[PDB]
């Protein structure tokens, strides 16, 4: 269930390409792409929290994301995954998305904001699932053979693998400080602010209310929010606030790997004729098919080749 | 298949961070200096040295 996320929050992280060809900090930044399954299913870990509202209630139609210094809600219907072409999402929970994507060299994820602003993040990723069986097919057939494969399942609990969540680092914000006639405002807005600077006024410390320094210039001083109530995943893109992270909690990872059976096609029968100690066959593949043969004796002389078109083969 | 794990980096704005070794299957640790990291709201670290 989603009870484990009651004390957690969405977070922002750096994204190498925000869709404009330029990098920025983004609410939809990806953390990792996992492709352990052999059936081609992808498991994507993102900073977004899906199925959880900002009020910590459970709603499968909503996602929550980080917006500046506050959590915010958005429709789950606006969530998308894409590679070389639009990708189909098979299910979601928390930070994890299951989807079946078409082959491509890149992968991106995004959603529509509360202001109807699109957000996306793109990462390089080679997606090209392994071949199951001896034939290369693009879709499952009406009739065929069944072979073993690995997939992800919809189980959402007791997966035994967990992610650590820790109290976040100080969050800098240049918007907190402004310059009003020779003085600096601070403007806390409900969140405790730490401030300090190399100023002759030597005015530094914590505040819970607007504090006017009264001597220094806004371009001289730094400030950040330090008081946080909810913890976040200790992502590699977020600085540690201590040698060892504090307020440690744990979130289990949904969608474990499982043993399932995949359907594969069977190539149509060849046309066969015979000569003297010779077999001649015409192959009629629709898709690349492996042909191989061996002698049933001491020296098998094994040979194999791929055929992508009608071919005459003499053995 | 092996998995690579990278815990959040630790930043010490005004001093040198120290390193402890570990007995994990394949472990490395290094300290870098002269870093001046930024966040979405502006520079993270106050000290420029």
């Amino acid at each position, epitope marked *: 269930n989603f009870n484990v996320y009651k004390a957690t929050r969405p977070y922002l992280a750096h994204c190498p390409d925000c869709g404009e060809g330029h990098s920025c900090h983004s609410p939809v930044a990806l953390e990792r792409i996992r492709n352990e399954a052999t059936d081609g299913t992808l498991k994507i870990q993102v900073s977004l929290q899906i199925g959880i509202k900002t009020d910590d209630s459970h709603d499968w139609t909503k996602l929550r994301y980080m917006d500046n210094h506050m959590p915010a809600d958005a429709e789950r219907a606006g969530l998308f995954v894409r590679t070389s072409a639009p990708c189909t999402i098979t299910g979601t929970m928390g930070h994890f998305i299951l989807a079946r994507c078409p082959k491509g060299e890149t992968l991106t994820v995004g959603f529509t904001d509360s202001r109807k602003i699109s957000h996306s993040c793109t990462h390089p990723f080679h997606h090209d699932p392994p071949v199951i069986g001896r034939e290369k097919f693009h879709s499952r057939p009406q009739h065929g053979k069944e072979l073993p494969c690995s997939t992800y399942v919809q189980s959402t609990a007791a997966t035994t693998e967990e992610i650590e969540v820790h*109290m976040p680092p100080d969050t800098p914000d240049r918007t907190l400080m402004s310059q009003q006639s020779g003085n600096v405002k601070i403007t806390v807005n409900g969140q*405790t602010v*730490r401030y300090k600077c190399n100023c002759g006024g030597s005015n*530094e*410390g*914590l*505040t*819970t*209310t607007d*504090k006017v320094i009264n001597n220094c210039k806004v371009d001289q001083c730094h400030a950040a929010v*330090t*008081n*946080h109530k909810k913890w976040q995943y200790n992502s590699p893109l977020v600085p540690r*606030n*201590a*040698e*060892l992270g*504090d*307020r440690k909690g744990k979130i289990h990872i949904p969608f474990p790997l499982a043993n399932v059976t995949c359907r594969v096609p069977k190539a149509r029968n060849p046309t066969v004729t015979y000569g003297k100690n010779q077999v001649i066959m015409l192959l009629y593949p629709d898709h690349p098919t492996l042909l191989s043969y061996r002698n049933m004796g001491e020296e098998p002389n094994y040979q194999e080749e791929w055929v992508m078109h009608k071919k005459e083969v003499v053995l | 298949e092996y998995k690579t794990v990278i815990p959040s980096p630790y930043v010490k704005c005004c*001093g040198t961070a*120290e390193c*402890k070794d570990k007995n994990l299957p394949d472990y490395s640790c290094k300290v870098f200096t002269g870093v001046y990291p930024f966040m979405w709201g502006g520079a993270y670290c106050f000290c420029d040295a």
Partner: antibody
Amino acid sequence: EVQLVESGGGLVQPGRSLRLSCAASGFTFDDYAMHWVRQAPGKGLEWVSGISWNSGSIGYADSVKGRFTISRDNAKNSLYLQMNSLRAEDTALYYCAKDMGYSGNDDYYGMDVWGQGTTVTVSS
Amino acid sequence: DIQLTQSPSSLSASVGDRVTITCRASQRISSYLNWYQQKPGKAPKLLIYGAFSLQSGVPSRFSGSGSGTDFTLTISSLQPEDFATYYCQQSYRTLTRTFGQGTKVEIKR
């Protein structure tokens, strides 16, 4: 299950030395720095000495800087404090405490585990 | 040598009352201040560290706060079990940790 057990103490004459030690249990000794803290009757807590992991750094309070020596035995999971030339002013309860890291240079931490302090009395 | 300053003696409060204890340094020591709780006959226990993080096992009644250079410990509603002497501590980013004198809480009568 995590605890520190103090050993040693008792009555000693002025100018004489006394050895204190603590046994660690329930946690990995080599993952944390250790400190000694003492509390005289009617007084608050006073830090005495501390030792970093692998003895990378050694600190002492000014009042005992030239008189006390701190060491640790990782193989035995134990902490030691050697007090020389004890004075009447050194009478106090002596506690062992565990830090929250391997280094004492992290100011984000406090002392999370404390033992049961022993009594050291210095008098002729 | 930087000393810490706290309430001069003790506070008097009843059960359910709001209790505020403060600690400040004469000079800047660190960005964080820790709080400890001690009862007679017992070793001191860590209450808050990092000036914000509550130690595990500690009731939500206790919380960190502050203003300027003054660090604050707040008890939202004093309980019979919360009558203890509280101490402030700062490390100065070295082994030589510095402790305050402590503030005692007495029962109102």
